């Protein structure tokens, strides 16, 4: 049972390390894509819907301005993002199809996930029923089991970073804070609402911060609002560090029990961080109806199927101000992004 998981994970590590040690580089060119529409813009850069002319396939192309990455001190984080994304392979992790760079920009061409962000659906509907949230939570549990076995820390879990595919399953799309680390790490990064108390308290932290963020995600999906919110991030931190969580009266006893163990300030008591590892989560009563293999194999019927008018349809995404992709005649930050 856990022997089959062990075997699966061992072959997964073998495939990952080959790509980790020998990364794919310069696999396409900007001129091979027809730029269609901006899907999103933020600290992650700009993401555009593109059409690959040689195949007619649609993709999501992330554009990062090299000079902006430098000013924002995201060089190493950007090199981590691309190195890890090109190396991983899991049903709930978005595929990196091509990467390349020019004088001005870095480009990551990923599979286009047309269902839109979980965030959009979650805010509109208000909240997900427990079976609905459990279906998505189970996919993250398996994804973190996969990632952590490769010594990867994720650090960017939130509904804004989870997309819904055509089959109703989750696609984890944001590797900007992902890092391969064996010991502890100290970078202050992530989103206020999702930060573990050890990150806020400037301690060295590890993969246990991803299990805390999962507690935050499960609560927000099932309640419609996060366990710790305020108008200012300082007030959110004050709530996270105090050891108090309040649950909606509609929360089941099993759900509250799982969430008290995930949103555990004490690391020697936090689920996912103990001797039994991920099995403390997989075997919790709230997950009793979950068939982990059927979830991985994508055999379970999804609680929600997004509206899909056709290929290239962007109705599940918000509208953004379009800006022209300007490529300078001069190479910027060549040395910094040499390995990209």
């Amino acid at each position: 049972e856990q022997e089959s998981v062990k075997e699966f994970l061992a072959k997964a590590k073998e495939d990952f390390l080959k790509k980790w040690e020998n990364p794919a580089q310069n696999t396409a060119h900007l001129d091979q894509f027809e730029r269609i529409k901006t899907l999103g813009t933020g600290s992650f850069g700009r993401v555009m819907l593109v059409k690959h002319m040689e195949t007619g396939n649609h993709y999501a192309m992330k554009i990062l301005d090299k000079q902006k990455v430098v000013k924002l001190k995201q060089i190493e984080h950007t090199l981590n993002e691309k190195r890890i994304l090109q190396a991983v392979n899991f049903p709930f992790l978005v595929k990196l199809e091509f990467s390349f760079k020019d004088n001005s920009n870095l480009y990551m061409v990923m599979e286009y996930v047309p269902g839109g962000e979980m965030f959009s659906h979650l805010r509109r509907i208000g909240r997900f029923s427990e079976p609905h949230a459990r279906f998505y939570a189970a996919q993250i549990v398996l994804t973190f089991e996969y990632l952590h076995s490769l010594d990867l820390i994720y650090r960017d879990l939130k509904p804004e970073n989870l997309l819904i595919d055509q089959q109703g399953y989750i696609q984890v799309t944001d590797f900007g804070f992902a890092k391969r680390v064996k010991g502890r790490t100290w970078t202050l990064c992530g989103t206020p609402e999702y930060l573990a108390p050890e990150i806020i308290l400037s301690k060295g932290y590890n993969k246990a911060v991803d299990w805390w963020a999962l507690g935050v995600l499960i609560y927000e999906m099932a309640a419609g609002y996060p366990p710790f919110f305020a108008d200012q991030p300082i007030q959110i931190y004050e709530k996270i560090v105090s050891g108090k969580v309040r649950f909606p009266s509609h929360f089941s006893s099993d759900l509250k029990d799982l969430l008290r163990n995930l949103l555990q300030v004490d690391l020697t008591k936090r689920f996912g961080n103990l001797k039994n590892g991920v099995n403390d989560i997989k075997n919790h009563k709230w997950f009793a109806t979950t068939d982990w293999i059927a979830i991985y194999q994508r055999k379970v019927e999804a609680p929600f199927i997004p509206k899909f008018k056709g290929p290239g349809d962007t109705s599940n995404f918000d509208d953004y101000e379009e800006e022209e992709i300007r490529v300078s005649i001069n190479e910027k930050c060549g040395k910094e992004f040499s390995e990209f």
Binding site: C189, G224, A230
Partner: peptide, 18 residues
């Protein structure tokens, strides 16, 4: 209600990374 307090807050949109 907590839902009404959340909806009236300035943190219901896409949240920026720190």
């Amino acid at each position: 209600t907590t839902y009404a307090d959340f909806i009236a807050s300035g943190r219901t949109g896409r949240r920026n990374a720190i």
